[PDB]
Write a structure and sequence with these properties.
Layout lengths: L6 E6 L5 H6 L5 H4 L9 E4 L2 E7 L4 E6 L7 E3 L3 E6 L2 E3 L2 E2 L2 E3 L9 E3 L3 E6 L6 E8 L1
Antiparallel strand pairs: 1-12, 2-3, 3-4, 5-6, 6-9, 7-8, 10-11, 11-12
PDB class: lipid binding protein
Keywords: Schistosoma mansoni, fatty acid binding protein, site directed mutagenesis, molecular dynamics, vaccine antigen
Assembly: monomeric
Length: 133
């Protein structure tokens, strides 16, 4: 993975709100999704990659390879895993393994606009984030 390296803040919250309630999310974290644009900051720490996720409720850093399922401890009170693989350098299936299980979230960059389609059986929230230098 080296293509979409940077800090990334949300351009459109298309249904990034009912996707959280379908998983089962608290009435405090369910609205920073569609309010304070998540800083999903994908960066190489030496050799393997680190999400420096800096939001108002989830301000947290987590390091990972393309393979091992990395866990984030959330402001609901939930340690949620994320099974990673790069297809190549604009399609990466970083699939969130929660106490409900999120369905394949497919991180596809559309020319410096990181488009990760979050579905959960039947939702599909097109998460589009702009590259910040």
């Amino acid at each position: 993975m080296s293509s979409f390296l940077g800090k990334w803040k949300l351009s459109e919250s298309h249904n990034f709100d009912a996707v959280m309630s379908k998983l089962g999310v608290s009435w405090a974290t369910r609205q920073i999704g569609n309010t304070v644009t998540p800083t999903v900051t994908f960066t190489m720490d030496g050799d393997k990659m680190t999400m420096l996720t800096e939001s108002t409720f989830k301000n947290l850093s987590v390091t990972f390879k393309f393979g091992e399922e990395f866990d984030e401890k959330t402001s609901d009170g939930r340690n949620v895993k994320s099974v990673v693989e790069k297809n190549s350098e604009s399609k990466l299936t970083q699939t969130q393994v929660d106490p409900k299980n999120t369905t394949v979230i497919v991180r596809e960059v559309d020319g410096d606009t990181m488009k990760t389609t979050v579905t959960v059986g039947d939702v599909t929230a097109i998460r589009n984030y702009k590259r910040l230098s």
